[PDB]
mmCIF file of C-alpha atoms and ligand atoms in Angstrom:
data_model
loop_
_atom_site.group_PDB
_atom_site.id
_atom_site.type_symbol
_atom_site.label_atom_id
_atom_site.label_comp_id
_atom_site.label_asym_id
_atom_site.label_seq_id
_atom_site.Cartn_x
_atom_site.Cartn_y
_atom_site.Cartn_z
ATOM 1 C CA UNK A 1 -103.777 56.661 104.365
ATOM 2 C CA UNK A 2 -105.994 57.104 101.289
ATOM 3 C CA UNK A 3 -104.183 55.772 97.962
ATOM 4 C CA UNK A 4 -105.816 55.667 94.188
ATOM 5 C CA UNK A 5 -107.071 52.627 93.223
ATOM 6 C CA UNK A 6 -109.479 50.970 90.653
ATOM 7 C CA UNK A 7 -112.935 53.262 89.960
ATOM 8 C CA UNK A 8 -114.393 50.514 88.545
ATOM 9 C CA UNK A 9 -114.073 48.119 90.598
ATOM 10 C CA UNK A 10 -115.246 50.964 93.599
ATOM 11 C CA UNK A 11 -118.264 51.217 91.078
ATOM 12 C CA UNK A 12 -119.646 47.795 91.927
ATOM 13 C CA UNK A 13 -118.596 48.361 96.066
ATOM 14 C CA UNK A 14 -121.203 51.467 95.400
ATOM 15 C CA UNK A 15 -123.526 49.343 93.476
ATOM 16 C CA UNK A 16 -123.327 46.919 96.044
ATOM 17 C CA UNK A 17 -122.927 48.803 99.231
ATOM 18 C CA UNK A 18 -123.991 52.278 99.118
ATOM 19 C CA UNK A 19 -126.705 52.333 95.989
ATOM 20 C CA UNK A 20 -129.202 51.366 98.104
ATOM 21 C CA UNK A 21 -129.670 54.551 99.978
ATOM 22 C CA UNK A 22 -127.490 57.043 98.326
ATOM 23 C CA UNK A 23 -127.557 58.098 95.067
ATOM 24 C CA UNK A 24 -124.456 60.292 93.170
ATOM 25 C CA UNK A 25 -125.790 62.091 90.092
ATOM 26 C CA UNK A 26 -125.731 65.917 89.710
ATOM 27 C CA UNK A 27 -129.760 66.627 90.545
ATOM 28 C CA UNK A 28 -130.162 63.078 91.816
ATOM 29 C CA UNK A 29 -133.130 62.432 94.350
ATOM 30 C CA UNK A 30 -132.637 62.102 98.386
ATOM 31 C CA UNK A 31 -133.242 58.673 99.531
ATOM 32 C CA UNK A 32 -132.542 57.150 103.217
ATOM 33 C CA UNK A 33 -129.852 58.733 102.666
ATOM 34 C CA UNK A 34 -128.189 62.556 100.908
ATOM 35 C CA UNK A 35 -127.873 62.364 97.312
ATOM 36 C CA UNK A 36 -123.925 62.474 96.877
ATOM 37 C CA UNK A 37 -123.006 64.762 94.140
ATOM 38 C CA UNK A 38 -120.683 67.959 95.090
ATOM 39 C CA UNK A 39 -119.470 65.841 98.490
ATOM 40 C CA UNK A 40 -115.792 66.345 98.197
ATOM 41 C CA UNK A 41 -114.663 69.530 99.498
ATOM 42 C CA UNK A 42 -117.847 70.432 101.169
ATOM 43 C CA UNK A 43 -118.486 70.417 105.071
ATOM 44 C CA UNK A 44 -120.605 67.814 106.467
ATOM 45 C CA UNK A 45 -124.640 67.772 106.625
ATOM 46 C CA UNK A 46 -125.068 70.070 103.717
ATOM 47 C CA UNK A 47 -126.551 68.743 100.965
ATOM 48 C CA UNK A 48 -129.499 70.838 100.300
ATOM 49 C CA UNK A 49 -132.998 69.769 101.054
ATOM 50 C CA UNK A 50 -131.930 66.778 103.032
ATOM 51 C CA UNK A 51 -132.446 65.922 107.002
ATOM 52 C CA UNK A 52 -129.408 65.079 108.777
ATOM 53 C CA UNK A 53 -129.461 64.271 112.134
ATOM 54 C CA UNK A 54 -127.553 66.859 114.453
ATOM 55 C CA UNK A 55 -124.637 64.499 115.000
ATOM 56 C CA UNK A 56 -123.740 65.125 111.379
ATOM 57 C CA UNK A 57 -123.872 68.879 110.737
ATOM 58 C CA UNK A 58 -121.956 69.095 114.235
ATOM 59 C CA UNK A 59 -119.300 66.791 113.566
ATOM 60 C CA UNK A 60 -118.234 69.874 111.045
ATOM 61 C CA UNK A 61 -115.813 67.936 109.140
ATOM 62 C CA UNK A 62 -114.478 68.847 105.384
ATOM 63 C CA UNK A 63 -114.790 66.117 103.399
ATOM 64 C CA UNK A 64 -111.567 65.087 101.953
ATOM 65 C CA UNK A 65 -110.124 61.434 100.434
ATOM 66 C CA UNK A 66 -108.703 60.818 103.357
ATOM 67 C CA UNK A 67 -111.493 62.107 106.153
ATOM 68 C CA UNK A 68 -113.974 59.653 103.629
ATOM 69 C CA UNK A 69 -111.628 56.982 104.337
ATOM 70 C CA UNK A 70 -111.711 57.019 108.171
ATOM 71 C CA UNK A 71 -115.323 57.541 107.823
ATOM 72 C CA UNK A 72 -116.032 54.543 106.349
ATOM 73 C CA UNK A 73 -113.920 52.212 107.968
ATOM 74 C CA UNK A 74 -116.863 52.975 110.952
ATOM 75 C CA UNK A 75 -119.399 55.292 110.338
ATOM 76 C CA UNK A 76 -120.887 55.163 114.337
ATOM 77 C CA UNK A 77 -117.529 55.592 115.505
ATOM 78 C CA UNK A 78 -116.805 58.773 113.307
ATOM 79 C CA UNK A 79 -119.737 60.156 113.830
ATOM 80 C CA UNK A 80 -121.745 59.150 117.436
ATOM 81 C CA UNK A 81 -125.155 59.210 116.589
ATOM 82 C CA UNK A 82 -125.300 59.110 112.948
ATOM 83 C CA UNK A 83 -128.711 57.583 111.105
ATOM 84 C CA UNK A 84 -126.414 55.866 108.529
ATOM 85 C CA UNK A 85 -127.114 52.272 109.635
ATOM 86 C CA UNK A 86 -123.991 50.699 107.957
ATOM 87 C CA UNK A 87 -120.787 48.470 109.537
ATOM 88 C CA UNK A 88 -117.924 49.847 107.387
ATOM 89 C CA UNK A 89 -115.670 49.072 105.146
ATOM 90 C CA UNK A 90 -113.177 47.046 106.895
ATOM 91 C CA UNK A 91 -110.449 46.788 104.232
ATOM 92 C CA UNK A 92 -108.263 49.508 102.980
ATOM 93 C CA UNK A 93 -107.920 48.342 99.855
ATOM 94 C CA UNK A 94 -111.996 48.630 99.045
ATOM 95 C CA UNK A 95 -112.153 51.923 100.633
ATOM 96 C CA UNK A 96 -109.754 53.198 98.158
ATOM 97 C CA UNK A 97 -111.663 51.608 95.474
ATOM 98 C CA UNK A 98 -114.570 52.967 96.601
ATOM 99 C CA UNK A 99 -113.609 56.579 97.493
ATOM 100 C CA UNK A 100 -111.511 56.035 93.609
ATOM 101 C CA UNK A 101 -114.980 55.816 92.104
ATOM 102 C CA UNK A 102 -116.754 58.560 94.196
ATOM 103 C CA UNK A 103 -114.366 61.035 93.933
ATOM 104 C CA UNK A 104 -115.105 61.159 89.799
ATOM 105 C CA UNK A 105 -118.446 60.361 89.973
ATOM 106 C CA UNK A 106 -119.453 62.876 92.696
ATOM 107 C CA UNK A 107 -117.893 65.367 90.584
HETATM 108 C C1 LIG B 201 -128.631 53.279 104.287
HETATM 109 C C2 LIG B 201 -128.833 52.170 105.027
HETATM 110 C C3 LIG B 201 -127.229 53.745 104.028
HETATM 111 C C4 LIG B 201 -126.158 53.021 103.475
HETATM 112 C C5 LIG B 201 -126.142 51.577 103.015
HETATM 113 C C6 LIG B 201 -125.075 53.906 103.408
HETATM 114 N N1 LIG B 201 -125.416 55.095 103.891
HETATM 115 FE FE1 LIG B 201 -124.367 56.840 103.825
HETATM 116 N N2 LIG B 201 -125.744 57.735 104.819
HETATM 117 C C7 LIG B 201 -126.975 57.287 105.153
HETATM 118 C C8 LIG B 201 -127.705 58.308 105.939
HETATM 119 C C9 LIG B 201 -129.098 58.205 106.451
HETATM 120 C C10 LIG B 201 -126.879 59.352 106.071
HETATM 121 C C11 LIG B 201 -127.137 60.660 106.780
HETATM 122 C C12 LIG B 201 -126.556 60.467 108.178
HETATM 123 C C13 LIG B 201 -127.073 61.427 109.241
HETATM 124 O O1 LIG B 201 -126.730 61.253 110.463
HETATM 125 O O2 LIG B 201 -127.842 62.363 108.938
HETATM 126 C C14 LIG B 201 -125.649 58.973 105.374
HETATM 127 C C15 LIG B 201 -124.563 59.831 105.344
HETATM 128 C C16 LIG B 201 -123.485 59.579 104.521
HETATM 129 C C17 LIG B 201 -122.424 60.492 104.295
HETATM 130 C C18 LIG B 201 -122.220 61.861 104.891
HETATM 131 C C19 LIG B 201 -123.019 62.894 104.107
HETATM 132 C C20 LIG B 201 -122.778 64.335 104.485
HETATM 133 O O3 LIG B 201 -123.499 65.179 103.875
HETATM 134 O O4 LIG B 201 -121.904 64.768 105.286
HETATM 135 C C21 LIG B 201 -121.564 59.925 103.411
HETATM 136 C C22 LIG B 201 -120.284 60.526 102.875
HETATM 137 C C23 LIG B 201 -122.064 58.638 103.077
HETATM 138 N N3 LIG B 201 -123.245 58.446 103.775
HETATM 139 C C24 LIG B 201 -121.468 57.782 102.182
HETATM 140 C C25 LIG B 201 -121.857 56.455 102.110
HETATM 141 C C26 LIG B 201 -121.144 55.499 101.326
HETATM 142 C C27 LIG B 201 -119.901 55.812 100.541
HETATM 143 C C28 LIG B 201 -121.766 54.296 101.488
HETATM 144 C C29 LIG B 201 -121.338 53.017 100.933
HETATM 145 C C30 LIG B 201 -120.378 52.429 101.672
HETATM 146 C C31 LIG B 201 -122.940 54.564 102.389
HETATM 147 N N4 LIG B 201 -122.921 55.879 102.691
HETATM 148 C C32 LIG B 201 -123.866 53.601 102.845
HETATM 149 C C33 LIG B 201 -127.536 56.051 104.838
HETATM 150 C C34 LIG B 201 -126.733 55.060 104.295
#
């Protein structure tokens, strides 16, 4: 599913969509929502220090490009009983832009 596309236009998606409860730097603080860094590659619900609700340590999912994509398209769906209170990302073409961006930035 997942293709490459522009990281800077996923930038402003993140900006946009994301920034407001997530933030991506290496030692970046916890808001609503994890701090990002390190996500790729690791297992769901483990970025340390922060809450998660059971639904997402239990869904016990490696985050990949292509498990981020489906994710996003509908977070509830993905994950029943997630906190994240956002829709999705309904077109493919700005969940590759976004998950473009994330994938360097997280790193
Ligand atoms: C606040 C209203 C949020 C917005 C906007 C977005 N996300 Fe979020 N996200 C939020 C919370 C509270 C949580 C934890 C969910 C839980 O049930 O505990 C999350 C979780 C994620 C995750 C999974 C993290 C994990 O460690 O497994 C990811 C990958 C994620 N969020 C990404 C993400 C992106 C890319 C967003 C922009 C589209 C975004 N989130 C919006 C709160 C909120």
């Amino acid at each position: 599913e997942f293709k490459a596309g522009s990281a800077k236009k996923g930038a402003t998606l993140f900006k946009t969509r994301c920034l407001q409860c997530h933030t991506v730097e290496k030692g970046g603080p916890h808001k609503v929502g994890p701090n990002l860094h390190g996500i790729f590659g690791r297992h769901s619900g483990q970025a340390e220090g922060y809450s998660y609700t059971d639904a997402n340590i239990k869904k016990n999912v490696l985050w990949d490009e292509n498990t981020m994509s489906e994710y996003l398209t509908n977070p509830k769906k993905y994950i029943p009983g997630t906190k994240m209170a956002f829709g999705g990302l309904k077109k493919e073409k700005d969940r590759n832009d976004l998950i473009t961006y994330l994938k360097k930035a997280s790193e």
